[PDB]
Amino acid sequence: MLPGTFFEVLKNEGVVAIATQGEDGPHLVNTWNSYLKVLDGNRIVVPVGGMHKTEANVARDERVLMTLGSRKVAGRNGPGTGFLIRGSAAFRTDGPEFEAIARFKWARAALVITVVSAEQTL
Ligand SMILES: Cc1cc2nc3c(=O)[nH]c(=O)nc-3n(C[C@H](O)[C@H](O)[C@H](O)COP(=O)(O)O)c2cc1C
């Protein structure tokens, strides 16, 4: 479950990060809201085109942390706010995830995240 404020930050431009737990250390990678997609049941998706260690890390462990933010709403670090979130990841080359990310031309997979809980931080 997520606050309305989460969605409103996704609606805007910002950077996001995804800490993919695997085994040989979690890999806190980056992405842009302009590349992400939200689904119902608060499921979110990231287009994986070159998140390699993250591919191995999801394949070993579903555990992921996700930091999102925007440059259009003021937080603590400069005029940019965001949240720390947790969920289970799953790579898919199928579903409304892969369809709604198909709009890109460099996606190798839809890194689907089944978010569970958020807290506002930055
Ligand atoms: C700001 C930023 C956004 C990025 N966005 C994406 C993205 O949405 N999808 C992607 O596959 N690669 C993206 N990358 C490139 C790499 O995937 C990213 O650097 C990642 O850490 C590499 O992780 P890996 O060791 O698992 O390959 C992005 C890199 C940066 C710095």
Q: 23, 60 in Cβ contact below 8 A?
A: yes
Q: Answer for the pair 100, 45: CB distance below 8 angstroms, yes or no.
A: yes
All structural domains of the chain:
1-122 (2.30.110.10)
Show the DSSP H helices in the chain as ranges: 4-10, 52-60, 95-102
SS3 55: helix
> Hey, is 33 helix, strand or coil?
helix
Distance CA 96, CA 58 (A): 20
Q: Ligand 1 center to residue 56 CA distance, Å? A: 14
The answer to whether the CB of 50 is under 6 A from ligand 1 is yes
Instruction: Give the burial class of 74: count Cβ atoms within 10 A of its Cβ; 0-12 exposed, 13-18 middle, 19 or more buried.
Output: exposed
- Closest C-alpha to ligand 1, atom 17: 51
Q: How far is it, in rounded angstroms, from Cα 107 to Cα 30?
A: 15
Handedness of CA 35, 96, 50, 59 (dihedral sign): positive
Find the 118 Cα to ligand 1 centroid distance in Å. 22
Which amino acid, 61?
D
Contact status, residue 114 vs residue 95, Cβ threshold 8 Å = no
Helix (H, G, I), strand (E, B), or coil: what is residue 34? helix
Ligand 1 atom index nearest CA of 55: 26
Which residues are 60's β-sheet partners? none
CB 95 within 8 A of CB 110: yes
Task: Give the distance (Å) from ligand 1 centre to CA of residue 29.
Answer: 6
